[PDB]
Amino acid sequence: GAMGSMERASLIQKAKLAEQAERYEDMAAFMKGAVEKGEELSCEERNLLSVAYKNVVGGQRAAWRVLSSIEQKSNEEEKGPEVREYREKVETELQGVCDTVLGLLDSHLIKEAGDAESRVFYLKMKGDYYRYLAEVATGDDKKRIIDSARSAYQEAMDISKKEMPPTNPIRLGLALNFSVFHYEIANSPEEAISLAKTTFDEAMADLHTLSEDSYKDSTLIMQLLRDNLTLWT
């Protein structure tokens, strides 16, 4: 790895600088290097890893959607293979980023994560990046990719419900994304709606236990659940 010669602490420091400069590809490479040092990640370091790759894959997903739309229109004047070729190029890049993240989780973040907050975080991430693979998958391994996302989300859910209070932001963000998995990927809008509503209601009833700062963290994610329920119902 090109980051093998840099100190772990220097990689984390530069990841934070890259975030300030909105250089997310750099940020991701720095955090990949930090992960490959082999030590577990702190809470803040996990969120640096997540922010970096979410922004990288977010740009790829947005570009893929633009190109896929153009391609679908083209298939309703013939302009040659270029639209498909370039959509395939972006798609392959996107799949490579997803494979990279999943590789870091499998070697060896998840197996060393024993605390609920780390294990749920990583399993949610595993579900997320299989979901992004599912967004562009067509047919053959599409079913297996979808089941891999489902399995990761489900293990994360089981742990979060046993070990975390209903207002825990990690638990809430997991439920949010799993509900979108149901709605957008698994063709299960009723499951999506039920999960979002139950998650929201159980969090509501637990808010009274929280400090002002924790209340703000939890209600921010609860608003995203409500925003989806407004779109879906």
């Binding site: 997320d128 963000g173 994304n177 979108v180 989806n228 779109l231």
Partner: peptide
């Protein structure tokens, strides 16, 4: 477009 964690 559904909202996921940002």
């Amino acid at each position: 477009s559904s909202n996921t964690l940002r």
